[PDB]
Amino acid sequence: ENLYFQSLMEKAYRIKKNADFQRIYKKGHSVANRQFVVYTCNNKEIDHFRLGISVSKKLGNAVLRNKIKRAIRENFKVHKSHILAKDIIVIARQAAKDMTTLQIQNSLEHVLKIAKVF
Numbered sequence: 001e002n003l004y005f006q007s008l009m010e011k012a013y014r015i016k017k018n019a020d021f022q023r024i025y026k027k028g029h030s031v032a033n034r035q036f037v038v039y040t041c042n043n044k045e046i047d048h049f050r051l052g053i054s055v056s057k058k059l060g061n062a063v064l065r066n067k068i069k070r071a072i073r074e075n076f077k078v079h080k081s082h083i084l085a086k087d088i089i090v091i092a093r094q095a096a097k098d099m100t101t102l103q104i105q106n107s108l109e110h111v112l113k114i115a116k117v118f
Contacts, residue, residue, distance in 0.1 A: 013076075015052030015087060024052075024089050031114045035099060035107045037091040038115045049083040049117070051076050055092040068092045071101060075108045084117045 015021065028041030043050065053072055055065045072090050076083065090111075096104060112118060 013048065013050050013080075015050045015089065020087065021052055021054075021089060024087055028087070028089070029115075031111065032093070033107060033111045033114070035093055035096040035104065036111045037093060038111050038117075039089040039091075040086045040115050040117055043085075043087045046085065046087070048085050049076075050087045052087070052089045053092075054089065056094075059092060059094060060097055064097055068096055068104070071104045072108060075105055075112075079109075079112075079118070082118060083112075086117050088112075088115075088117060 015024075024039050024041040028039040030037060030039050032038065051072070053069055055068050057065075059065055059068070069092075072092070090108070096107070099107060
């Protein structure tokens with residue numbers, strides 16, 4: 001269906017509130033590979049995963065930041081059906097910029113396996 005209704009459903013899988021980010025940083029578990037830090041945390045009110053993304057401004061220019069965000073969202077679309085019901089924050093590290101599009105997907109899958117979400 002259309003872009004409006006796609007966005008209706010997909011908004012539920014996104015973490016928007018700064019309060020949620022900060023709760024997850026304080027209460028969640030963290031792991032990291034060279035390209036990504038990942039925090040995960042249970043949300044008792046929610047029975048499906050949610051994703052929040054952080055790409056620092058230090059990483060580079062807007063085109064690059066948007067490329068990294070896109071690659072993360074794309075990976076979660078590929079695996080939507082089998083991500084455990086956790087709130088998840090993905091933080092791109094400086095080194096994510098040094099990877100190709102294929103590499104960054106593999107790196108994401110690896111880190112998310114370490115984080116035990118799957």
